[PDB]
Write a protein that binds this ligand. Structure first.
Ligand SMILES: *[C@@H]1O[C@H](CO)[C@@H](O)[C@H](O)[C@H]1NC(C)=O
Length: 72
């Protein structure tokens, strides 16, 4: 059995705003299920051009740090 958090790129988007891409991790493994074992949170600011009154939004994003073989 093995399970690893692997670096990925991921899209952070929101209706009416410009999507950004950030580093995150994804679980990859074979458990003889590979799920997040440690995580944290980040604030990602998206620019929303066109919208003068709310020109940006902060989206809260969970960052996976480590993964492990866990029940279900
Ligand atoms: C995965 O991402 C972190 C974040 O910067 C980086 O420091 C680390 O070296 C990366 N791991 C690999 C295997 O590239």
């Amino acid at each position: 059995a093995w399970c690893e958090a692997k670096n990925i790129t991921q899209i952070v988007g929101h209706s009416g705003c410009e999507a950004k891409s950030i580093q995150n991790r994804a679980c990859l493994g074979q458990c003889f299920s590979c799920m997040p074992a440690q995580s944290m949170w980040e604030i990602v600011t998206l620019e929303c051009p066109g919208h003068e009154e709310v020109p940006r939004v902060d989206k809260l994003v969970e960052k996976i740090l480590h993964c492990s073989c866990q029940a279900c």
